[PDB]
Design a protein around this ligand. Structure first.
Ligand SMILES: Nc1n[nH]c2ccc(Br)cc12
Length: 293
């Protein structure tokens, strides 16, 4: 029998874990003996399993399956439905949930040493991803999962794209729901996504971590304040682009160490080529951890 081949009939629903963009994730027990002793897994499925969505979902599955790293959620297998060929992605279940909820829950009880451990781990997952020429496009604390107190993993790849052989960016022609408050200026203006725009988003993740997910301090709350809460729909994007062009930025989180703040601000460079590399960020973060320890 194939362990990566899961029969949907044996999957028992336990609880809902999240909904992002097109897919929904559920906690399920794979219980073929039907006695509640089987493994608990996370199961991602599509809410609207159209032709086009299914095609994109299958590419996402191949992306995750190709990744093997301590800080990337583990692929376990796939479910296939008879007939129209609906797909479910089976992944390891990480019991402490999303980093966003985890931090929002425990707040400052998670100290700076711990936050920088998570930062380094996120950096390393992204650096590895980049070696495969994948662009995440959706790096945010809501897409990072907590395995235990000492380890986080990048947990969703629903927007992930593979770079063309000959280009260092991927251009999205018809944008869907976009996390614009995590987007680099060139992603907003030209829909260009690259390792460097992932670095920009990583700076926003660093901001998220050091604000402890204080709601009034979220990137959407802060950017909306800066452009004016009166701005709506497409005008938000127009004014955000103008703000960023004029070096409008998220503020330093209260109590943030200057060395960490410096990293955020370097990630948020309008000049794409001047943003740091994930290889260098991992080294820099680990050095800061070493100095603190
Ligand atoms: N809690 C989780 N464990 N594993 C997951 C995979 C994807 C998503 Br979304 C959540 C989880």
């Amino acid at each position: 029998r194939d362990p990566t081949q899961f029969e949907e009939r044996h999957l028992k629903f336990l609880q809902q874990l999240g909904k992002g963009n097109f897919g929904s994730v559920e906690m399920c027990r794979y219980d073929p003996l039907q006695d509640n002793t089987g493994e608990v897994v996370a199961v991602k499925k599509l809410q609207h399993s159209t032709e086009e969505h299914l095609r994109d979902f299958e590419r996402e599955i191949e992306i995750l399956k190709s990744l093997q790293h301590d800080n990337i959620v583990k692929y376990k297998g796939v479910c296939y439905s008879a007939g129209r060929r609906n797909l479910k992605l089976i992944m390891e279940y990480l019991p402490y949930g999303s980093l966003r909820d985890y931090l929002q829950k425990h707040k400052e009880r998670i100290d700076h040493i711990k936050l920088l451990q998570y930062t380094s781990q996120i950096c390393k997952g992204m650096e590895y991803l980049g070696t495969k020429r994948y662009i995440h496009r959706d790096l945010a604390t809501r897409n990072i999962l907590v395995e235990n107190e000492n380890r986080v993993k990048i947990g969703d790849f629903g927007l992930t794209k593979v770079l063309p052989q000959d280009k260092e960016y991927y251009k999205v022609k018809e944008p869907g729901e976009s996390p614009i408050f995590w987007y680099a200026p060139e992603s907003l203006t030209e829909s260009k996504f690259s390792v460097a725009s992932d670095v920009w988003s990583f700076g926003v993740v660093l901001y998220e971590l050091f604000t402890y997910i204080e709601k009034s301090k979220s990137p959407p709350a802060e950017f909306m304040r800066m452009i004016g809460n009166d701005k709506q729909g497409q005008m938000i994007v127009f004014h955000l682009i103008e703000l960023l062009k004029n070096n409008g930025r998220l503020p330093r989180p209260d109590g943030c160490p200057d060395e960490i703040y410096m990293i955020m601000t370097e990630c948020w460079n309008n000049n794409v080529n001047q943003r740091p590399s994930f290889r260098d960020l991992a080294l820099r973060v680990d050095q800061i951890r070493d100095n603190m320890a």
